[PDB]
Amino acid sequence: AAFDDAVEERVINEEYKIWKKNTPFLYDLVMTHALEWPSLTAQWLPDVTRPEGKDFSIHRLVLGTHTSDEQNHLVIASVQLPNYGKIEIEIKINHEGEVNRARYMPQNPCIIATKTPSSDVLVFDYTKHPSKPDPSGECNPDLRLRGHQKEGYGLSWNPNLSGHLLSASDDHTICLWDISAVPKEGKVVDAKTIFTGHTAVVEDVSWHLLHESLFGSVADDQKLMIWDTRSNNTSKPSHSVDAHTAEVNCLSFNPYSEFILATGSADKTVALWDLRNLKLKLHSFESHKDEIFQVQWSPHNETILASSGTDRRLNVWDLSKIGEEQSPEDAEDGPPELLFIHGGHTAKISDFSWNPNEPWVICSVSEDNIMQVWQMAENIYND
Amino acid sequence: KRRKL
């Protein structure tokens, strides 16, 4: 008498019908693609090819596989975008276990770090591997980063210190590696520093974008922690905030507002934070119906951020609309700061990435192996 | 804590 509620599902399919029927009015772009396997991870590479006098540009994504066999890959996919275009797998690299998360290094986007079900973080240089995977089934990472006892998801490259990499784990710790001086030839590298302030699964970690010594972490202990690598005490952060009424799954620093960040939580809210006074939450974004797992600021607009999670929705928020007036009927669809609800996915969303070269384009991937590349209608973000 | 599948 327990699977009957899981058989709705019927509600999902009905809402999907309605959504597809309305995409002409809500979107300027909708591309849907069933991947061979679900990807737990998605990140646009920063580069973009705009071929000679053609009406499209070529973009690329770091993706992964999630299969229960022994043929998992780190994937690089290409995406033709116009200036309701195809999607091609360019490279597959043998990967040990499913790819929990894959992130390119800002100072050299050929370098990809991945999180694996074994506690290791693997580093690949995808230019050093063939386009077709090794039929031996063997995984040959360019670096093997040691230090965790359990898998995790949080992964962050320092954008101001080349090769300084943070990782968050279910073992309650945060590992910092510095691979800057290490030749990427398959060596094992031990963690330079291990931060132990959290008392529960650490869900996410993220470097500040301007201050090279500052980073933040969020964990199942409901805390946001702000760390400073200049501190000698690796068991106690600079700041600790009781951030949510449940697990905190993600955080993201505003790339235009150096004091501002956001966290997403199993309490179904996105919280807004000001580093200058972390005692006081600036705002709580409240319309997700289930646990939030990913939050990301717009790369192009300082007031714009997006959140996704297990309610299969991707919410786009506009903090400049906080406090706005709305007609009582318009006030039913949600708060004024809720700019858009993406309802294209029919399963839990695992990751999404704002395209850094085409404003308002987003790639989101879900558990049913669907990948969507989409852009809300221009009239929605111009009112 | 995330659960896969």
Author numbering:
A (entry chain A): 37 to 119, 129, 144 to 442
B (entry chain D): 81 to 85
The authors write:
Polycomb repressive complex 2 (PRC2) plays a critical role in organ development, adult homeostasis, and tumorigenesis via enzymatic activities to di- or tri-methylate lysine 27 of H3 (H3K27me2/me3), which is a hallmark of transcriptional repression and gene silencing. Through interacting with RBBP4 and SUZ12, AEBP2 stabilizes the core PRC2 complex, thus significantly increases the HMTase activity of PRC2.
Via the sequence alignments, we found a conserved RRK-rich motif (residues Lys379–Ser390, hereafter referred to “AEBP2379–390”) near after the three zinc fingers in AEBP2. After crystallographic screening, we obtained the co-crystal of RBBP4 in the complex with the AEBP2379–390 peptide and determined its structure at a resolution of 2.15 Å. In the complex structure, electron density corresponding to the first five residues (residues Lys379–Leu383) of AEBP2379–390 peptide could be traced. Arg380 inserts deeper into the axis channel of the smaller surface of RBBP4, with its side chain sandwiched by Tyr-181 and Phe-321 and with its guanidinium group creating electrostatic contact with Glu231. Lys382 binds to a well-defined cleft on the surface formed by blade 2 and 3 of RBBP4, with its ε-group specifically contacts with Glu126, Asn128, and Glu179. Moreover, Asn231 and Asn248 in RBBP4 create hydrogen bonds with the main chain amide group of Lys379. In contrast to wild-type AEBP2379–390 peptide, the binding affinities of AEBP2379–390 peptide with mutations Arg380Ala/Lys382Ala to the RBBP4 were reduced by approximately 20-fold.
